[PDB]
Design a binder for this molecule. Structure first.
Ligand SMILES: Nc1ncnc2c1ncn2[C@@H]1O[C@H](COP(=O)(O)OP(=O)(O)O)[C@@H](O)[C@H]1O
Ligand code: BEF
Ligand SMILES: [Mg+2]
Lengths: 495, 417, 50, 50
């Protein structure tokens, strides 16, 4: 009995993978799946065999929840006065006494459970390693290639998987080659593959440099950030502490040697090494290289950067798929816009001096006063609504009638915004065909349109439950009204 | 109804009570079973019970409430407590949990505690608003506790002897080194009676280890407070059980800012019991002890400390020597340097019927200035100096003579001058 | 694998015994057993019914 | 006596019924809620046998 359990727990081979705690948790699960067969009532039975102290004791988990099905494990939130349960959750009991013990089929079940758990413990150890050793590039020989993933080995039963997005779109894969990658994820209690290696994630390139460039690793060239389109293009912004270091000529090597070497190691991936700057504007300027920009409009609130390249290099500035921008949009994490080609491509002198259509009636006491003022900007129209008098004194012509007209126009704007709010709040529009229906007055029509229908044809296609939660009516008058509607719409045969 | 209100009553009285309650004559079952059946009948009558018990946790998770007269042992009168209360209040070992209880149905064995009412004579919020024992700052003995009775009796001798040799304070760790036949048990009785009659403000709790049943009866109804004993009718397992009971109870009561005095006799017996209960580690040292078999006794003797923020824990423990064996000698070696208070009882003066037989030479007190004031220390020092002329036997003569002519400390001091 | 060998050894006697390989009555004929006769080979352990 | 009234009885009144502990309650739960019924509901046509 319990002595046999003690013998078999002291006789397990993988005591490092399956210590006594996990062994008796296995036995808990085995007794649970055994009691699943002992009684027709599918129940959970923790048994806490107390491996060190004694033998098993079948417990009946109250399994606190409002339902009743399988009532051996059904208790509501307060049925805890008896026996001193006194708890809304966690209170458990032992109703089953002298349950079935160790039939041969249950022995076979415990056997298969313990062998699959030895496997699962090997998996748990290798994934603890997977999680701790999240580090440098690792070599491995592949075993199987598929359309969605490939499988790799290192030796000593070190299985790993490289997913489709982790590979390259054109890197030919066949079972038997030594491929190198970077361990990236952590998955403690997975079911399929254990280790996860990638060759396409951005930081991979970082570590590439960290093992290639002799400068990085001693923290003289602090790599700032990087973005990557898998197997296509890797942009990377770096920052140096020393002043006599030239990362434009040191990180790449001698006429494209280090960058070219790490590109061949990547499997044919272009790389753009850029110098990181503490200014996001200058950073997004230099990141889109090779490209020149003379129109920089950076707004911090909406996270945008109007970075317009001069006309002519467009086909090279954006590139295929917008890579040179996308990676930039992934380097800083901002948004970029370029649409202008010839019509005032400055995008900063244009919008500042193109308002001849909206500023037609602003100082409409007499148009012969002065033109509009671009010193304040006159370009947001809403933060402009309330400005202090600390700058409302430089321009000439601000007589008292001017501020009186300002107040009148403020009243007009308040009235128009109130009208707009009334129009946008009344998404009901009760037409005459809705008020003319007998028994449906103005508030009833408002609510009927708030239900979701604003016409007459669809009204006849709703039940009593669709009119439930009615305010002003009740299910019998509901049925009366829906019958009148289906008569005037369907049973009337009129149009 | 309650436990002690029935347990401090004799067995014949409980039998008559159970027969008066209309029950199967209970003179056939033990007293614990008598009270168990009486409580079961009272709960059958249509009401709840109000019980009290000191708390014990094993590796299982729920709690056992042991009673006082049971010497904190396993029995049917021990109350069951669901682990939910332990998860709620984190009630460690050493709570006299007082609360409402219900009778057990079939499939159960003990009464179940419904709700908490009293946590060590305090509000259950103290169960959630308190400080643990391992975190406070242990200090030296600050308060001075007088030992002399004050009647001029013939056993007052012993007390006043100690008072003029080495007084006792709150938070002290006293170890008495004495060979067999030196007057140990009546010394325990004398000092306990004096501390409980002179200072009822302080709380007493006496521990007896490996004594005779008549000694247990003479100890239990003679001194105040709880008298916990563990004789030979229980194995070393139940010995360590009651020992850990009383130590965690004292720890929790001290955490509750209470003064707890623990008399213990002897230490070698509990050390042998522990050696009996701890398995071997492949090696045997001098005397036949283990490596970790000393860790339990060490902890047990060193749990004493003075709590300057509230409450205190003092222990007065006797040791066995001159037993012919080695293990007792090495145990005395290990425990003579760990205590902050050492006293010795001689056997040569004891066998001459000259009591008490104090070793005025090897007697000492750790940092006695915190236990003795200005001219108080002056008097004590000059008397130590004048007794210093090498003497054991006629030194005991001088002490006992000048102590028998006189009644208090100041009388002796002002008549010797 | 010797792991499986020591496994099936320490758990008594166990292997791929899913094989039914058991006699049943022919489909269509009823009856009531009134006698059983078992004969063992010299050396084979006799069951309790024998 | 009849479950016609126990249908208007939730589990709150199970452990409040005197002398309903571990095994009696176990049976009350098993042989009731394993036959398809639910402890606590409401019907409408029990009087007229229709
Ligand atoms: N203070 C005392 N006054 C008179 N007799 C004493 C005193 N102390 C010890 N004795 C004598 O010594 C003996 C001690 O016996 P016992 O109590 O069994 O020793 P122990 O206390 O060491 O176990 C007693 O018989 C008693 O007569
Ligand atoms: F009672 Be004696 F001191 F062993
Ligand atoms: Mg004695």
């Amino acid at each position: 009995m319990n002595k046999e359990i003690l013998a078999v727990v002291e006789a397990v081979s993988n005591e490092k993978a399956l210590p006594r705690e996990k062994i008796f948790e296995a036995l808990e699960s085995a007794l649970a799946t055994a009691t699943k067969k002992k009684y027709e009532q599918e129940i959970d039975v923790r048994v806490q065999i107390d491996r060190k102290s004694g033998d098993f004791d079948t417990f009946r988990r109250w399994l606190v929840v409002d339902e009743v099905t399988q009532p051996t494990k059904e208790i509501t939130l307060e049925a805890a006065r008896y026996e001193d349960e006194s708890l809304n959750l966690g209170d458990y009991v032992e109703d089953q006494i002298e349950s079935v013990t160790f039939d041969r089929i249950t022995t076979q079940t415990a056997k298969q459970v313990i062998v699959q758990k030895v496997r699962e413990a090997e998996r748990a150890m290798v994934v603890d390693q997977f999680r701790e050793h999240e580090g440098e590039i690792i070599t491995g020989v592949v075993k199987k290639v598929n359309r969605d993933n490939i499988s790799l080995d290192l030796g000593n039963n070190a299985e790993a998987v490289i997913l489709r997005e982790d590979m390259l779109p054109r890197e030919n894969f066949r079972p038997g080659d030594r491929v190198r990658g970077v361990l990236y994820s952590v998955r403690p209690e997975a079911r399929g593959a254990q280790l996860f290696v990638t060759r396409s994630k951005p930081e991979m390139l970082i570590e590439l440099f960290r093992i290639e460039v002799p400068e990085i690793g001693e923290e003289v060239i602090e790599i700032k950030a990087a973005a990557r389109d898998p197997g296509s293009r890797a942009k990377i912004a770096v920052k140096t502490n020393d002043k006599r270091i030239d990362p434009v000529g040191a990180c790449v090597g001698m006429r494209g040697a280090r960058v070219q070497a790490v590109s061949t190691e990547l499997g044919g991936e272009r790389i753009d090494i850029v110098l990181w700057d503490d200014n996001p504007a200058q950073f997004v300027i230099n990141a889109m290289a090779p490209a020149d920009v003379a129109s920089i409009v950076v707004d911090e609130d909406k996270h945008t950067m109007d970075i317009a390249v001069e006309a002519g290099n467009l086909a090279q500035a954006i590139g295929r798929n917008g890579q040179n921008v996308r990676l930039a949009s992934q380097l800083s994490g901002w948004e970029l816009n370029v649409m202008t080609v010839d019509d005032l491509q400055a995008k900063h002198q244009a919008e500042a001096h193109a308002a001849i259509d909206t500023f037609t009636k602003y100082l409409d006491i007499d148009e012969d006063f002065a033109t509009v003022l671009v010193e304040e900007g006159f370009s947001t129209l809403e933060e402009l609504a309330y400005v202090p008098m600390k700058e409302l004194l430089e321009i000439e012509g601000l007589d008292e009638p001017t501020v009186e007209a300002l107040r009148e126009r403020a009243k007009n704007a308040l009235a128009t915004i109130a009208q707009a709010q009334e129009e946008s709040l009344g998404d009901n529009k009760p037409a005459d065909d809705l008020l003319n229906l007998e028994g449906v007055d103005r508030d009833l029509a408002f609510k009927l349109a708030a239900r979701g229908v604003c016409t007459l044809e669809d009204l006849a296609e709703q039940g009593i439950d669709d009119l439930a939660d009615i305010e002003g009516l009740t299910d019998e008058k509901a049925g009366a009204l829906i019958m009148a509607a289906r008569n005037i719409c369907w049973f009337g045969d009129e149009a | 109804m309650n436990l002690t209100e029935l347990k401090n009553t004799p067995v014949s009285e409980l039998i008559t009570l159970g027969e008066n309650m209309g029950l199967e004559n209970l003179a056939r079952m033990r007293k614990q079973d008598i009270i168990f059946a009486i409580l079961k009948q009272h709960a059958k009558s249509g009401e709840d019970i109000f019980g009290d018990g000191v708390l014990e946790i094993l590796q299982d998770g729920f709690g056992f409430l042991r009673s006082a007269d049971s010497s904190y042992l396993a029995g049917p009168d021990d109350i069951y407590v669901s682990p939910s209360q332990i998860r709620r209040f984190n009630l460690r070992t050493g709570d006299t949990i007082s609360g409402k209880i219900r009778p057990p149905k079939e499939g159960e064995r003990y009464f179940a505690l419904l709700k908490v009412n009293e946590v060590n004579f305090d509000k259950p919020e103290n169960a959630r608003n308190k400080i643990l024992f391992e975190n406070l700052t242990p200090l030296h003995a600050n308060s001075r506790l007088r030992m002399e009775r004050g009647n001029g009796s013939t056993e007052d001798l012993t007390a006043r002897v100690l008072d003029l040799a080495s007084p006792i304070g709150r938070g002290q760790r006293g170890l008495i080194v004495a060979p067999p036949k030196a007057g140990k048990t009546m010394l325990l009785q004398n000092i306990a009676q004096s501390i409980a009659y002179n200072h009822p403000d302080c709380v007493l709790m006496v521990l007896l280890i490996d004594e005779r049943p008549e000694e247990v009866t003479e100890m239990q109804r003679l001194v105040k407070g709880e008298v916990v004993a563990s004789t030979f009718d229980e194995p070393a397992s139940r010995h360590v059980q009651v020992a850990e009971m009383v130590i965690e109870k004292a720890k929790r009561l001290v955490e509750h800012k209470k003064d707890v005095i623990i008399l213990l006799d002897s230490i070698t017996r509990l050390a042998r019991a522990y050696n009996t209960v701890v398995p071997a580690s492949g090696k045997v040292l001098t005397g036949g002890v283990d490596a970790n078999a000393l860790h339990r006794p060490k902890r047990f003797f060193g749990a004493a400390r003075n709590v300057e923020e509230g409450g205190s824990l003092t222990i007065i423990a006797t040791a066995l020597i001159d037993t012919g064996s080695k293990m007792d000698e090495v145990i005395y070696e290990e425990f003579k340097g760990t205590g902050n208070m050492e006293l010795h009882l001689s056997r040569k003066i004891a066998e001459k019927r000259v009591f008490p037989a104090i070793d005025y030479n090897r007697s000492g007190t750790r940092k006695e200035e915190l236990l003795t004031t200005q001219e108080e220390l002056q008097k004590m020092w000059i008397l130590r100096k004048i007794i210093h002329p090498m003497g054991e036997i006629d030194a005991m003569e001088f002490l006992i003579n000048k102590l028998a002519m006189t009644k208090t400390n100041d009388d002796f001091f002002e008549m010797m001058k | 694998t010797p792991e499986e060998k020591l496994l099936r050894a320490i758990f008594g006697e166990k292997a791929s015994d899913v094989k039914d390989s058991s006699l049943r009555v022919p489909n269509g004929v009823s009856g009531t057993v009134i006698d059983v006769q078992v004969f063992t080979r010299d050396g084979v352990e006799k069951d309790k019914r024998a | 006596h009849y479950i016609g009234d126990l249908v208007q009885r939730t589990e709150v009144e199970l452990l409040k019924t005197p002398n309903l502990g571990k095994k009696s309650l176990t049976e009350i739960k098993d042989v009731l809620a394993s036959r398809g019924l639910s402890l606590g509901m409401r019907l409408e046509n029990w009087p007229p046998a229709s």
